Amino acid sequence: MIYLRKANERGHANHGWLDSWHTFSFANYYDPNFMGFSALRVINDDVIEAGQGFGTHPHKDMEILTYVLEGTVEHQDSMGNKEQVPAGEFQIMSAGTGIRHSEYNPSSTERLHLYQIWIMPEENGITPRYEQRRFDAVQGKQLVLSPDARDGSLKVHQDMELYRWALLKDEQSVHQIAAERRVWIQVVKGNVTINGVKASTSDGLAIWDEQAISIHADSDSEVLLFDLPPVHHH
Ramachandran quadrant class, 88 (left: phi over 0; alpha: psi -120 to 50; beta: rest): left
Give the technique used to solve this structure: X-ray
How far CA 135 is from CA of 17, 38, 87, 94, 130, in Å, comes to: 29, 26, 12, 20, 17
- Domain boundary among the residues 135, 170, 205 is at 135
Range of the domain at 113: 11-135
Which candidate, 138, 136, 139, 165, places its Cα nearest to that of 227?
165
- Best CA proximity match to 106, nearest among 56, 71, 130: 71
The residue from 83, 102, 135 where one domain ends is: 135
Pair 104, 64 in one domain = yes
Judge whether 234 is annotated as a binding position. no
Specify whether the CB–CB gap between 87 and 71 falls below 8 A. yes
Bridge partners of 1? none
Q: CATH number, domain at 145? A: 2.60.120.10
- Does residue 128 share a domain with residue 28? yes
Residues 112, 69: Cα–Cα separation, whole Å: 8
Contact (CB, 8 A) for 120 and 39: yes
Asked whether the beta carbons of 167 and 215 are under 8 A apart, the reply is yes
Q: Of 80, 102, 135, at which residue does a domain stop? A: 135
Residue 57 labeled ligand binder: yes
Regarding whether 162 and 126 lie in a shared domain, the answer is no
What is d(CA 220, CA 92) in angstroms, rounded to the nearest whole number? Answer: 27
Residue 191: burial class (beta carbons within 10 Å; 0-12, 13-18, 19+): middle
Full DSSP string of 105-128: ---SS--EEEEEEEE--SS-S---
113 is in an annotated binding site: no
What is the sign of the dihedral through the CA atoms of 131, 89, 213 and 140?
A: negative
Residue 58 CA to residue 98 CA, distance in Å, equals: 7
**221, 191 Cβ separation under 8 angstroms:** yes
Number of independent structural domains in the chain: 2
- Give resolution, Å, one decimal: 1.8
Q: Do residues 117 and 184 share a domain? A: no
Does residue 193 contact residue 219 with C-beta atoms inside 8 Å? Answer: no
DSSP the chain: -EEEE-GGGSEEEE-SSEEEEESS-BTTB--SS-S-BTTEEEEEEEEE-TT-EEEEEEE-S-EEEEEEEESEEEEEESSS-EEEEETT-EEEEE-TT-EEEEEE---SS--EEEEEEEE--SS-S---EEEEE-----SSEEEEEESS-GGGPEE-SSS-EEEEEEE-TT-EEEE---TT-EEEEEEEESEEEETTEEEETT-EEEEES-S-EEEEESSSEEEEEEEE------
* 125/228 same-domain check: no
Whether 103 has a binding-site annotation, put simply, is yes
Beta-bridged to residue 92, according to DSSP, are 65, 131
